[PDB]
Design a protein around this ligand. Structure first.
Ligand code: 6PC
Lengths: 508, 510, 509, 508
């Protein structure tokens, strides 16, 4: 009955999962909330069960995490990095089976499930180096006998709320950075990826316990919106990193602002690719396909708007069509598959509604647009032509593989059309024009947090800060100085003299 | 005759271009179709001059003109924008004494502090000029052959700036100089009771812009009250809103800006503590506490309001503080060598009396001061209260009045906790010679504030570092370090200059 | 017969100059060495005289500079920055008359003279900001109870030797940066630009004295090779910044290394411009003209090699010839003059020798190649085609306006030819190809300190670090973190605890 | 008679060592130069033999390294970091046996041998993070339509000459950083630690080979002064990093400067500890012992001068004497051993000469001063009192455990006494005075590259740049932005417009 109780899936026990799993970890495993069953999206069969957090579970866990912080903040940052390095090795030891679980419970293809674990592994290695580097400048005081220094210290407890579509890597990016910065973490993942959240936490818990560290340093409280909301309102959650829908994210942002907390918001995108007349069409067509259909269109960075110069529009559309027809559909863990199911049946319903609404707004389905007749949550990847750039359905983010195609003529209007949506995550132009590229990157260019040239909207690397502007929420994760969001800055002046000169020469 | 600006002894006000009635809207053009306000001298309760504030149409027209000017301003390279800011710096230098005198007249702080406040603006202009050659991000090594990876920084657009009465020049200036070199345009709304100062500052800046053939709306002014501030917080065209003011109002500003996914920079109240350990140099403690507590008549966000003294030295420090308080020269604040001026409004005087009375109700002892002074203007005695518990309600209330609550302590850990227990988190100071204690105060179990000082008072930051607080102080930073990043938007940019398309994390998709 | 005594040169007195000028400043003005007369290269007439430094002058000045350092290093960097700001203002007030002196004594046209002073003004502005910023990171120690910080402190006395061709801005860039970093300076300029060194030193001296600072913070000892050799051997000169010829610079570098001092070497260039087949020729032709004939070809960053793709070589050469013919020649202070004299008579002999050797090596002089028949050191700007890329004359740096033009076909061979010389100062390519640009900026591209795209090889802005690789000497000036060359780094670990955790977990007890 | 042929030392074969080993590696192993035998300094028995490089070997190896660079420089820096990370893992796998070999062939005790490999491991970790970080700023050009960027690129071939006393960690610090910066390396170690050089090179060669990279990326040419001099004069060695004697390093710097190459010089120190009257004597005494007798006084950072305030001089000396007596002498692999032999018999001769000269200069040997009666190069750790601060013998760098102890009265004079020597590496004060600590760190304080408070002169951590000033030569290794010495800076202006504005507004 349960897939975990079948021999074809026995590899699941290599992650320590069983028929019913505790979904609270705070140094002890438990869970007194409702028992959830998660299902495989490729065939709608139940996998295994997870005991979620009650409100009392949440309360005790927050309290144990903050107690653990007293020990953890006293550990020198490079020694904290050593813990994160060992997390990276423990992920390496299980990268194949953990990525297989991502494919089974979430539904993305195996190379992407494994790639998502690799992302976590890479940010661990990055964080280990950062743990010898984080800090601020010593600055020259205008005052004799005074030192001026910028200090950075952990904020305390970092709550981390993640979404279904990257159930490993977003948590990992938040976790590795927050840890070397001296914070403790509390994780609430998507309820429909509870087994993944448990498996990752099992890997981390062993590293902590092997090092005789309190496990609440990386706490887990599986649950739904009630846990998410409690975290948003909890003054003891010093920083709340939220990855999820723009609609829920706005309310998270407001609840955290109400209590003068700190939030890091990673919200939706409505990302555009723009192909100018001089673009390399050998580069445009596969870039569009990967960015539109990768992860069955379920990335925040998924290419949802394709603008093509009038001269090459019909040619690119025809070529994209013949390439969609060759997409290989099947079970996401089957090794010769490019395209798996959507994550939920609700997502199929939303996809179907968006398609029919695109038809009612005057669009033409030139490829796809049908729910597939097969077990699971499969839909056809879809191309829609003929809508105006400001069509209501086009300015809506639908987490589904629907690509809206538009004509354009001049650079100035199409830069404006890129920027006219409420979201601001990723953006790509394809062109060879040197001038046009630097204008794209400049103040009158793209307004997004990711601004790419001759590569698609998705698949960034960990060395840079990841996030967006406008309704994408403003937060950054991973690289550059994103670590600063997980710490508090102090500006510190130390008088080591016997005099008291005042700034600006004030003679009191 | 009744207006100060029409008396010959205050004729120096006209060196700032101020007249009997002044336009309070600037956007390239001077206007003001809203209410006319009269601002008053707190040292003698006489009216100074009038300002015609912004109507709603004025605000609407100014936002549009600023955003039009941004199209031109954003195309000027940063170093050339720095040259404009450098010229603003020179303009303030040439007016520093008479502008500081106006700050003393309309706001009420003493002359060395009014001049010192203009000096901060001059300092931040100098800083921003060098920064205009420096702002940007790293070129990073991509993991992909044939790709570049670069972090770009670009202006957010229109920066709205809302300021308070108690620093009517320096807070605007720190926001303005940094926002300008970062390629933003600005829209200023100051405290209505310091409207002449806002007008005078904007006349200085507008001349530099116009002399450089630039659209004046780059540094716009819309004088007005809470309805204008509320419009700025609700306006999607205001890309970043920097708000300095009360915690209560700032919380509502932050919520409104978050409601529209705007950006906000919040600089709210403090309840700042000085802590003197038993080993402290008392010859640094007593003068430092005096300046931090009675400076600006106790009306700074960074004013010391809580003084923790080790039990072994509590009585002696209190006695020496009392003797120091009695020495303070009181007078008109624009008079050189005056050390103590009036509170900004009559209401503040009443709230001073209110807090003193509540402090007595809660069991405290007024060991010095506590009364209004018998003279013209809004003068109160700088006041010292002993005997309250550290958790007394009146001691957890920011009041822009010169009242210092003094507490005893014994142990390091408890007094760090008492520093951290309040809702605000702006500034903090310990006085001690102990090396370990100092690094613990600066560390993760030490002060939770944005300013963490050792052997100096809570007030008087230099411009080279970032300025701001944590917790209910709102989290914004101004001035130094990389505070400039709050005025720009980061983008992480990958440029494929090859003929292949390898994907991150080595993912194969064919 | 001195120019300074003629009515039309009376503006020289606005710089405090007179008939015979003291060439030593250390708080007081002096000079007991040989008196030198400098001459205007536009008419070979004498301008004025400078009393140079004796050994006793040099000895007394080094001692005074190091005594002043005790005061100067105690002044907070932002307060030092305020001094540099006032130097910037005193330069702005005299920019026209100082530019004019640069034109008269050095010989570059007035816009470049004024523009060189502007460089110094610009870097003052930059340094004022830097004075609030210089320092190092606080780093996380692996040891509990320990702080780990990087401190930066001045080296002490910075000796600065400069050349004739940029007699203001190279000193200025070293000066502003060394000053905000807490160092005192000792200047020895080119003897043929002694009046410019004196006039600059007078402007700075007034600012120091006006601020009640000891004037030896910016000391001057005008002299020849004897003073520069003394500086290179002097253990009291903590950093020697030397701008000049590769030959002299190599010996300076050795002498400083012999005594374990620090040196900043800014030496010669043999800079190439490369025009690919896809280049905007409306960009190539004016860019090549400016880089090759600007300052009469006497910049270290002057373009001396021009690589043009085979397809466009003849078209570019003809357009450049037509462009050379339209250059306006005359007195460099006269309006709209774009080309003035070479700096010395010796430079004119070198110009002629290089051209003869060019034809000997098989070259073809397609334009110029002769001295002009007029007073001063005027030579025709010259274009030579037909040499191989590795001809001897083309690998030698001659401070004369001679442009060597080469054909190429493929990108990899021409990148290599850029890199094949001993110098490594500046380089430039003209192209629209996005991949070619990033390869030129990458590890298999240009090996130079300055690597440009669609602009010539000369005229840098101050925001970045300036200098070259290979025989150019490795030093950097002005922008980015060039300031670190003027300071010493310390790595400082502070135990504030009551324990002694050892690094790498070594248990030794 | 060879220890490697005794079954007692069979653990050496875990490092791939044999009776006769190849001392040249460039992807293949060889060596046509003289065969050197290295000896164990604790018993003067021969360990094994190494075939050193002939000049022909060196020429062949330089050429192969330069060709390998063309491949290596094209590998993206993060992927170069992945190679270094694997090098770090390969060292972890052999840390005990490699640490034992350091103790056997060099002579330091086992916790320090192991700890020296740990330095290398830690710098690999650090460099892995750096590999995603190295580069320069994008700057705002004053010219419209222009970009201004600071690029950093590899210099090419980095020659690395190391010394006997840290035969692993110094090479490692140079190697890990140079690798991620895109350089190839050529290593010439101390002839008397040739077996250590081969063993480290064997570990790195396996990683390179497993990753299908040319082995000459980390070349080795074992040899003496002829190889070292060829490297210093070789224009193909773009950067030469030299750790060693001040006398030899001066000639290396001159030879490199003659050819306009780059050199990084890490030379000797004459390092001082200063104990003020308010110092915690419980910190002072152990720190002085570890810093003075650690590694039998053979570190470049060894404490050789101890300045004690007059009021506490006698009590500190007496307490140090009572402590030196409890130093445990034995073989450097025997357990609980604090103190081993000197590296050579010549070092013993220099030791006796220095003790004899110190006595003739008026010093009193208050502890030690004599050769130990046992096999190997053992000498007693020695304390000398009574000398003036400028005594001739105290201003020699004798690489042996002799601590010269001086009195002082005032801060200004003893700071000057710290600074009066020719070397400028490490320095340390013990005090509680805030004002004195910040003066020591400031412009009138220590003139050294390492400036410590309440910790001794040795044992620095990898996060900061390591090196000294004055006759210590000025190079830096390891942390902060020391990576910049291994790369070349370029300032790059890109005109993406159709206009030609000149800098400073010059109209031509
Ligand atoms: O530290 C202070 O008192 C603060 C500084 C910035 C402007 C307002 N006042």
């Amino acid at each position: 009955t349960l897939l975990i109780n079948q021999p074809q899936y026995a590899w699941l026990k290599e992650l320590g999962l069983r028929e019913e799993n505790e979904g609270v970890y705070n140094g002890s495993w438990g869970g007194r909330g409702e028992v959830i069953t998660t299902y495989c999206p490729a065939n709608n069969e139940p996998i295994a069960r997870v005991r979620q957090a009650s409100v009392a579970d949440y309360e005790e866990t927050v309290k144990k995490a903050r107690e653990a912080w007293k020990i953890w903040a006293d550990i020198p940052a490079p020694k904290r990095g050593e813990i994160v390095r060992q997390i990276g090795d423990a992920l390496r030891e299980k990268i194949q089976v953990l990525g297989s679980l991502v494919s089974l419970e979430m539904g993305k293809i195996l190379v992407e499930g494994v790639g998502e674990v690799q992302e976590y592994v890479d940010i661990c290695d990055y964080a280990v180096g950062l743990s010898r580097m984080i800090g601020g400048p010593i600055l020259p005081s205008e005052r004799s006998g005074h030192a001026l220094i910028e200090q950075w210290n952990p904020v305390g407890l970092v709550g981390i709320i993640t979404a279904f579509n990257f159930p490993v890597a977003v948590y990992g990016a938040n976790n590795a950075i927050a840890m070397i910065c001296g914070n403790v973490c509390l994780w609430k993942g998507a309820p429909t990826t509870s087994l993944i959240s448990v498996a990752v936490t099992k890997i981390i818990a062993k590293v902590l316990e092997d090092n005789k560290l309190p496990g609440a340093i990386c706490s887990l409280t599986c649950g739904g919106a009630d846990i998410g909301t409690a975290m948003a309102k909890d003054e003891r959650v010093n920083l709340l990193s939220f990855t999820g829908s723009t609609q829920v994210g706005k309310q998270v942002g407001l609840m955290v602002q109400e209590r003068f907390g700190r939030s890091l918001l990673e919200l939706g995108g409505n990302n555009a690719i723009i192909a100018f007349e001089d673009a390399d069409l050998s580069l445009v067509v596969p870039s569009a396909l990967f960015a539109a259909v990768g992860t069955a269109g379920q990335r925040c960075t998924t290419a949802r708007r394709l603008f093509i110069h009038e001269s090459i529009h019909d040619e690119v559309v025809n070529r994209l069509k013949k390439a969609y027809a060759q997409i290989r559909v099947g079970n996401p863990w089957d090794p010769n598959v490019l395209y798996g199911p959507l994550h939920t049946k609700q997502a199929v319903s939303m996809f179907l509604g968006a398609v029919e609404e695109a038809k009612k707004e005057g669009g033409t389905v030139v490829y796809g647009g049908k729910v597939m007749d097969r077990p699971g949550n499969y839909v056809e990847p879809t191309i829609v032509t003929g809508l105006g750039h400001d069509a209501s359905i086009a300015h809506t983010e639908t987490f589904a593989p629907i690509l809206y195609v538009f004509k354009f003529k001049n650079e100035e209007e199409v830069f404006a059309w890129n920027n006219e949506v409420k979201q601001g995550l990723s953006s790509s132009i394809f062109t060879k024009d040197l001038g046009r590229i630097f204008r794209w990157l400049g103040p009158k260019g793209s307004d997004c947090g990711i601004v790419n040239v001759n590569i698609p909207t998705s698949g960034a690397e960990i060395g840079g800060a990841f996030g967006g502007e406008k309704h994408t929420g403003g937060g950054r994760e991973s690289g550059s100085d994103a670590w600063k969001q997980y710490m508090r800055r102090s500006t510190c002046t130390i008088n080591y003299s016997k005099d008291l000169p005042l700034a600006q020469g004030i003679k009191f």
